[PDB]
Nucleic acid binder design. Structure first.
Lengths: 112, 81, 50
RNA sequence: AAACUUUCAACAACGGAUCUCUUGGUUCUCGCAUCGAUGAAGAACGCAGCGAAAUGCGAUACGUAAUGUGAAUUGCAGAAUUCCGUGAAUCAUCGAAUCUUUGAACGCACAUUGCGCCCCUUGGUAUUCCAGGGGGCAUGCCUGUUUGAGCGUCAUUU
RNA sequence: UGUACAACGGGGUAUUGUAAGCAGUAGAGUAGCCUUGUUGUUACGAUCUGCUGAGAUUAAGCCUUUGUUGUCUGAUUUGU
RNA sequence: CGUUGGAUUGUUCACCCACUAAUAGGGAACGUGAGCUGGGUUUAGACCGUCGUGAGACAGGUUAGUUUUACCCUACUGAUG
RNA sequence: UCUUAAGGUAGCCAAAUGCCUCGUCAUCUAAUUAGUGACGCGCAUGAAUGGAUUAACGAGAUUCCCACUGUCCCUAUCUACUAUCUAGCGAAACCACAGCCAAGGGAACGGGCUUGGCAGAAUCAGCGGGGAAAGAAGACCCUGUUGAGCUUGACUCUAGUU
RNA sequence: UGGAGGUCAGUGACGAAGCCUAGACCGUAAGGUCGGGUCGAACGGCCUCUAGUGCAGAUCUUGGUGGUAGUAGCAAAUAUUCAAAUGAGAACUUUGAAGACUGAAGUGGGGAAAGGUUCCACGUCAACAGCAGUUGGACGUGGGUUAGUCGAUCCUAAGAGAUGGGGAAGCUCCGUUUCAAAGGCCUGAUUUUAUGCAGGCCACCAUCGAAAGGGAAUCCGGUUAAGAUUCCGGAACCUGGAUAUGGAUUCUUCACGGUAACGUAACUGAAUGUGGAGACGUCGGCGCGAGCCCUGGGAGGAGUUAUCUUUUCUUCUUAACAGCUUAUCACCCCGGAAUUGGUUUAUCCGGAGAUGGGGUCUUAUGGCUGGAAGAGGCCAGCACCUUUGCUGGCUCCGGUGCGCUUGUGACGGCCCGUGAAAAUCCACAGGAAGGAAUAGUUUUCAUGCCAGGUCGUACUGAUAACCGCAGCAGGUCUCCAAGGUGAACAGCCUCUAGUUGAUAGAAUAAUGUAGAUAAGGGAAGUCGGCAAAAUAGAUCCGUAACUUCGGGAUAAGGAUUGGCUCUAAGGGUCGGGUACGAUCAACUUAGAACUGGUACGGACAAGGGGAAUCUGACUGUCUAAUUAAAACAUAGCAUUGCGAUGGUCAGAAAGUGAUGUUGACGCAAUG
RNA sequence: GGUGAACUAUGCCUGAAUAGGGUGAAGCCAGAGGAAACUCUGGUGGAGGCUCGUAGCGGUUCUGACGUGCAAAUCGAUCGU
RNA sequence: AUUGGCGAGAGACCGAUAGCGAACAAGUACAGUGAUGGAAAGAUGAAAAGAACUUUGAAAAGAGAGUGAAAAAGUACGUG
């Protein structure tokens, strides 16, 4: 059929020189230059994808509203829900154990 | 073939124009002019290169200032009208 | 190349304007021995190699 | 016998020898002492009514100013009583200037006509942004100024 | 201006192998009618059979123009 | 007037198998590479044996290794004049 | 026992290493300086200067067999493009002068010289006998009181190191 | 012979010097003198002086010129032909007509390096295009390259390199954070007083280096002779810059909702710290999408139609951008699971919660609408010598797949190999700074304002625009990629697009180059089976010695293959009482007759095989341009040095280096 | 005393490129035989500095062409991968 | 002292293949990536008076004519 050409002066199949073929209202096939696909933001601890957070290029993240880049929870747009739950549980439990350890050390020294 | 087929492969200039002398002698990767020694302060010159000294010397250009020094001396470096 | 620099383009312009035959009236000037442009250039014949 | 081939002459043929010429060299001699951060030598790009060069010059661009001379310049064309004159000239002289981008090259870079920062002015209902005009910001060292640092150290401290 | 020469066409000759088209109750078979099944028929179907030793080619280094059609006064030289 | 066909060897010489009438000996720049070929020899690569401390040597053995030009004059072969 | 420390072990072999040598025997052929298998006082095989073996792989070297065929007996024919003739266009290598032989003598192999043979313009296509044809101041060899690369118990030093 | 001193008061524009002359005289000669032609300004005899002073050679130097010679030759890349026009002139220019070719890893459409105006228009023989030329990438004169969005510019990579310092006689060398006192954004200061100041945070540790790496943002239609993601029209987006308008709290000061995953138009912002994105290999199959290919109905146009074909070919398109809606993974609630279940093409997962039910999210990607039919495309019609417009119809609805290519997704192999960065942009704990009642918070929610500089941009990108002396069969990086056959971007043929360029005519001798065939024999040729031939695709059968058990192996060795008419098997979507069928024709395999000059992988395409020996284990590498090998490498094996104030190796030196971002399972040196 | 890594050699950094077949390694499913141990069969899957073979990269032989060449190394066919 | 620079005077020197490489748009044109390498090239005539015009040719040009002392000086030019 109709064969397309690159629209820029870069003649190489580089990762930043990706083209799709589109049909224009003029009825002819043209090369459209497609940008790099965005990678999902990852959790700081799990490294898993963060849901409720949009996939954009880093500079595209500046134009969007704040509600697209985070979650209503604490640590929202940075850590996973299960990460936040695990850290809350760990914090409370280890601090309770710290209190218990302090009390038991004090009471064994008072006995001694 | 080290001759014609290899000559087909030369398309990368190792020298470009030099700022100090427009000679196509500025080595791109070494960033040094092979003729005038730019960007060194001293223009490159050798006593075995007498022809080169002739090509690059006083009086081979316009002498925009040095041409009038003899006239000014002959007049005594005067000032006024 | 298409993606030139301004220095190369300026050299291109200088060479292009230099590349012209001798004016017809300099020939008619008195005590004039110049009959033609000796420094003429063709793009196929001699490369400027800049 | 012709054609052809050789030899000679005449005339005619690329060739540019010889001869004569010579604003060029090359040697000798005499005299003089003068490049540059007040930006040199060199480089690039441009400037003429009609032009690209060891012609000259720099956006005031084949040049401006001052001075001398005294009617040109000239290949062609032209602003102009420019001609008994503060006055033609591709004239001479040259002391006032201009002197683009560079270059030891100096804000940082420079295979980019790429990036700053600081003053003052103007415009955008602006000390912060943008733009325009102008003026600036290298290094080593010297002398001086000001601000400092160091229990290195001098005169007061239960 | 000759039963001369030539360009086409029959013949002879030879090479190949049975042309297109038309027809066949030929052909392995694939899907039904109703007028109640020894040729009723259709949408086809490589091949087979007949016309058909047919058709095609045949001097370009094999012949006639008994057929048709044309051609036949252009330039240089030769001393006993 | 003839004096061959072959196995092995780069071979000249050899040496066998045969045929044959016979398988005589030689020259022609040890005829004949602008006729060929390039097996050998005879550059540069490489292996081995012996020799040499070594670099290297070895008419010792192996393996791979560019074979250019005639259009001139003669001669020749044909062809005009 | 002697040299000189030890005397070639396992293996392997006329081997890419064996001169004599085309070794001797067997096999392969009609015939085999070839090939393979044996035999080894092996000029001069041999154990990480690695020995022996080894599946698979190999544009490596070699022998034989089948198939296949113009390699050959023994040549023939066909096609395209040349060569060939014409229009246009148009070089080069070479070149003392040139261009027919036989013999002689001669720098010992003549186109010229001597004695003979002979000997008729202008030429075209081929051709490869000659021009000791052309290509390159022989690369072999020798000489030069000419080099250079490499080596070493050469001469003389030297960087490093101690 | 060239110059010099004297002299001939020498010759000469009434003709000097030079040059030509089978004319003369003189001298043994070197040479001198004269006659005749050519011409145009100087020259000579004699006595002396002086030297760059006499040519046949030096493969002499530099120029010029020959014979060869109208000779070798202008023969690779299939190929040109007819007419007309233009023109003095046409094999070669132009336009038609035919025949062809490249055949989508093109002879097509763009680019990178390079070139530099070759791009485009206008005029003819001087040169050039090894023939010609009216043509040209030639000649002459002109015109041409328009950007906030494409690049550069910014970032860092290998690396280069100032400074501080240290070497070096020095040109300079090292070093790049080192034995250094190494700088920059907000309100108070912001006018009887300046950017001075107990105002804060502190501590990148120059710079250069990519037009293929990273990266803010533009698309469609039209327009030129030549530019366009740049111009015009329309429609968007990004970055940087103070109040504004609307929308979100206030008898709870920085919002609500949802069990939750999380949702929404918003919903404060400092240091400090932290996280993410930037940001990454390759291969294999599977899934999804885009484009293309294929195909049905319908609405237009075109081709043959001496016989046939609801035929054959072609138009039926929807860009960036905005909104809503769509996700395999992943996650969350109820729930408890062995008779273990769910599941992929590919034993993966589940009491650390499977299956089931219900939900949340990323928006790759698709759908709908806006953009937008007003565009573009396809048809039909109105003045006929004025630089030229308008009007009516359509631009519809679908299927199909181991299809091609591309992208994406979930996965699965591989490594003693695990496929680095930086700028930049977001986010997250903190409340340091404010107010509640004609306002105090919001420019991360909508709307509105302005600007976006500089340089490149034309064209070729190659059997003619680059390099190779050239318009050289060579070399030179990359993207798009139709139909048939077929396993196949191999070989053949053809649509789109492009080209028809390479000096021609005639004839067909030898010898050539390239391609073929051959009776009978079959390697007897030859150093040698060199060269050629034979073999060859697919299906079925069968397949040895040996072996490192992986191979050998397509071993060897046999058979079949066309056309036609049938047959069979292989699948997605639909329901039951009041043991099943559907408008579905998307391609693979097996079988059966029939049939023909024993043909059938019918052209193309396409292994010859076996028995051994020598040698190197193997893949791999090298003598570019005579040697591809048995040579080198290799894994494996062994040896050697070294524990850091070290080994090995650099440097003139150095406050200098490589190994070394290293540490004996390592570096270094060997066989 | 200077110039050169535009060819080429090697390292590094950043990019890009590479039809279609054959074979069929791990891992996995199922089945058969057996008293058991275990053995065997069919599938699946898609490994390899594997293999046939395009593009590519190279350059074996013809000791082909050409060898005052298209070319100071090319052309054609055969080839290696 | 002074092979540089500026100014000046000379020569038993050279005379366009000589003399500096360069008497000339010479360190120019062109060759190399680069360091570097590096030419050739002077003369019509006193004055262009550089050939009006006519004829043939498509044109270049030729043949006449013309200027000139000479065209045996026609720009491809001093004798050649």
């Amino acid at each position: 059929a109709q064969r397309v050409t690159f629209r820029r002066r870069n003649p190489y199949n580089t990762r930043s020189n990706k083209i799709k073929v589109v049909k224009t209202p003029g009825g002819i096939l043209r090369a459209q230059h497609v940008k790099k696909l965005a990678t999902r933001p990852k959790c700081g601890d799990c490294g898993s994808a963060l849901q409720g957070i949009s996939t954009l290029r880093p500079r595209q993240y500046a134009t969007v509203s704040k509600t697209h880049k985070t979650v209503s929870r604490a640590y929202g747009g940075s850590r996973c829900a299960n990460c936040v739950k695990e850290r809350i549980i760990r914090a409370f439990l280890i601090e309770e154990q710290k209190i218990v350890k302090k009390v038991v050390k004090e009471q064994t020294e008072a006995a001694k | 073939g080290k001759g014609t087929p290899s000559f087909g492969k030369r398309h990368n200039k190792s020298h470009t124009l030099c700022n100090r002398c427009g000679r196509r002698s500025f080595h791109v990767q070494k960033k040094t002019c092979s003729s005038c020694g730019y960007p060194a302060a001293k223009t490159r010159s050798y006593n075995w290169g007498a022809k080169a000294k002739r090509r690059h010397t006083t009086g081979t250009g316009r002498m925009r200032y040095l041409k009038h020094v003899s006239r000014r001396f002959k007049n005594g470096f005067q000032t006024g009208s | 190349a298409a993606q030139k620099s301004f220095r190369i383009k300026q050299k291109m312009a200088k060479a292009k304007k230099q590349n012209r035959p001798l004016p017809q009236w300099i020939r008619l000037r008195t005590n004039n021995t110049i009959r033609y442009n000796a420094k003429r250039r063709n793009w196929r014949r001699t490369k400027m190699n800049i």
